[PDB]
Amino acid sequence: MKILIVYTHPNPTSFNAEILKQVQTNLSKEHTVSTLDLYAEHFDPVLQFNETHKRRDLAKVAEMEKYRDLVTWADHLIFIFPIWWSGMPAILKGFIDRVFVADFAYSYKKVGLEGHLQGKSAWIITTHNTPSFAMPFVQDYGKVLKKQILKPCAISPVKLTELTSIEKISDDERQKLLHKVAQITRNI
Amino acid sequence: MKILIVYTHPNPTSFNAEILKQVQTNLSKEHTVSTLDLYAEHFDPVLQFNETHKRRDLAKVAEMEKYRDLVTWADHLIFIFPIWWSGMPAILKGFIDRVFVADFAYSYKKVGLEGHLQGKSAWIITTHNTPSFAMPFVQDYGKVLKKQILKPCAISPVKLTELTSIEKISDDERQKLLHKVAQITRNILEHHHHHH
Numbered sequence: 001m002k003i004l005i006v007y008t009h010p011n012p013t014s015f016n017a018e019i020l021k022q023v024q025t026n027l028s029k030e031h032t033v034s035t036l037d038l039y040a041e042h043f044d045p046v047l048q049f050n051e052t053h054k055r056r057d058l059a060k061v062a063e064m065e066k067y068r069d070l071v072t073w074a075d076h077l078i079f080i081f082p083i084w085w086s087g088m089p090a091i092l093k094g095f096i097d098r099v100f101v102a103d104f105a106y107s108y109k110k111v112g113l114e115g116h117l118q119g120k121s122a123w124i125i126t127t128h129n130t131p132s133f134a135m136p137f138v139q140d141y142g143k144v145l146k147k148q149i150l151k152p153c154a155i156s157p158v159k160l161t162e163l164t165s166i167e168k169i170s171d172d173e174r175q176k177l178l179h180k181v182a183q184i185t186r187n188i
Numbered sequence: 189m190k191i192l193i194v195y196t197h198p199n200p201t202s203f204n205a206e207i208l209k210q211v212q213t214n215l216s217k218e219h220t221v222s223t224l225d226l227y228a229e230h231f232d233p234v235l236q237f238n239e240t241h242k243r244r245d246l247a248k249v250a251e252m253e254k255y256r257d258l259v260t261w262a263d264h265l266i267f268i269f270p271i272w273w274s275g276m277p278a279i280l281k282g283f284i285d286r287v288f289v290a291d292f293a294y295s296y297k298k299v300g301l302e303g304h305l306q307g308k309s310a311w312i313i314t315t316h317n318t319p320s321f322a323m324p325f326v327q328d329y330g331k332v333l334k335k336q337i338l339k340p341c342a343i344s345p346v347k348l349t350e351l352t353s354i355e356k357i358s359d360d361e362r363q364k365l366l367h368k369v370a371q372i373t374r375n376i377l378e379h380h381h382h383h384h
């Protein structure tokens with residue numbers, strides 16, 4: 001299938017960068033793969049609208065066309081990012097804000113939303129330093145992207161993989177998680 | 189007291205803009221108020237770090253100094269923003285990402301975090317299109333900023349005011365919402381002081 005990896009981290013030698021490598025090298029050669037590196041793209045995540053350029057025409061904003069096309073093209077999206085303040089780094093938040101717009105990713109129904117991205121699945125891989133025993137007691141941490149962004153847009157299924165206590169654990173332990181990620185990737 | 193209003197909306201003629209005007213116009217004159225229009229400032233919400241500019245040195249990033257100083261100065265922070273995808277607009281998320289950094293807003297304890305913004309309180313005003321009965325059930329919708337950002341940084345108390353079904357309701361109901369903001373605003377006072 002057609003695979004889009006949306007990767008979010010400022011540092012090319014980060015652990016996230018390593019996670020990206022595991023995914024890229026382990027995806028079968030039968031898939032066609034594009035990597036979207038938001039930091040490398042110098043992506044501008046600030047959504048602009050007003051009376052001059054109306055919110056209604058956001059799906060037609062030129063600067064965002066490339067990204068709309070990458071999303072439409074894809075069958076499966078893989079998101080890689082660290083948890084910053086319980087959620088997506090700002091550049092990735094604004095990727096959603098700006099690219100997942102009405103009349104593209106969804107449209108408004110009599111009540112609620114009608115998702116337009118049917119036929120697509122996703123995988124979320126996220127790192128954070130919070131212990132797993134604590135996770136039922138915390139808000140978001142990837143649950144927003146999965147349950148309240150991707151799902152309402154008709155993207156299903158959405159697998160969520162959290163790698164927890166990521167800075168407390170050891171290099172050994174981290175490398176076991178990378179191996180887990182590599183194997184999940186092969187099993188797609 | 190010293191009040192920092194952090195305002196987030198791209199449209200000067202938005203309903204959020206009118207919320208801002210209500211807050212600004214109704215704060216007691218005893219307060220010193222400063223408004224931070226993140227959009228007007230062309231704030232860059234993208235946190236940068238790498239081997240060159242280490243994460244360790246975020247609290248000394250030059251471009252953010254003006255904003256660190258605003259937070260330090262403030263006794264009370266008022267956040268005004270619309271809910272986009274269950275939370276903060278990317279520009280405001282990045283304000284937290286870049287400004288509320290370790291060795292400024294917080295540091296690491298033997299075990300947890302210690303907030304350093306003690307002695308500060310906050311008020312969050314959010315607007316969205318979701319029914320208010322859904323609020324206890326949805327993730328975030330301002331709860332992350334209140335419970336999982338502000339609070340851990342030792343800011344307290346924090347009041348969360350949700351303006352719900354904000355687009356479905358009538359223009360009259362919305363004006364009644366503005367009344368509510370205006371009146372809560374008037375009761376922002378140092379203890380045993382009245383509104384000037």
Ligand SMILES: Cc1cc2nc3c(=O)[nH]c(=O)nc-3n(C[C@H](O)[C@H](O)[C@H](O)COP(=O)(O)OP(=O)(O)OC[C@H]3O[C@@H](n4cnc5c(N)ncnc54)[C@H](O)[C@@H]3O)c2cc1C
Pocket residue numbers: 009013014015016017018082083084085086087126127128129130166167170171172174175235285
């Ligand atoms: C602004 C900000 C906000 C934060 N908010 C939250 C909060 O809401 N919740 C909380 O739980 N966390 C929070 N964090 C922490 C954050 O989620 C982590 O720092 C992140 O998940 C780690 O990923 P990284 O790629 O940045 O790690 P990195 O700093 O790059 O590396 C992490 C560790 O992995 C190691 N490593 C790198 N490569 C390898 C490898 N090949 N083999 C073995 N180990 C390796 C490193 O050397 C290091 O010890 C926040 C951090 C920031 C900067």
Ligand SMILES: Cc1cc2nc3c(=O)[nH]c(=O)nc-3n(C[C@H](O)[C@H](O)[C@H](O)COP(=O)(O)OP(=O)(O)OC[C@H]3O[C@@H](n4cnc5c(N)ncnc54)[C@H](O)[C@@H]3O)c2cc1C
Pocket residue numbers: 047055097098197199201202203204205206270271272273274275315316317318354355359360362363
């Ligand atoms: C990218 C994006 C993501 C979104 N994600 C979600 C989702 O996660 N959750 C969901 O609930 N909503 C969400 N929304 C919608 C959003 O939260 C609302 O549009 C917003 O809260 C409204 O505030 P505003 O400043 O933008 O309103 P405006 O659109 O500017 O105004 C809204 C209404 O109030 C009116 N109004 C303006 N001034 C006055 C006044 N002086 N007196 C009386 N009426 C006035 C207007 O004329 C209009 O009818 C999303 C929107 C966007 C753009």
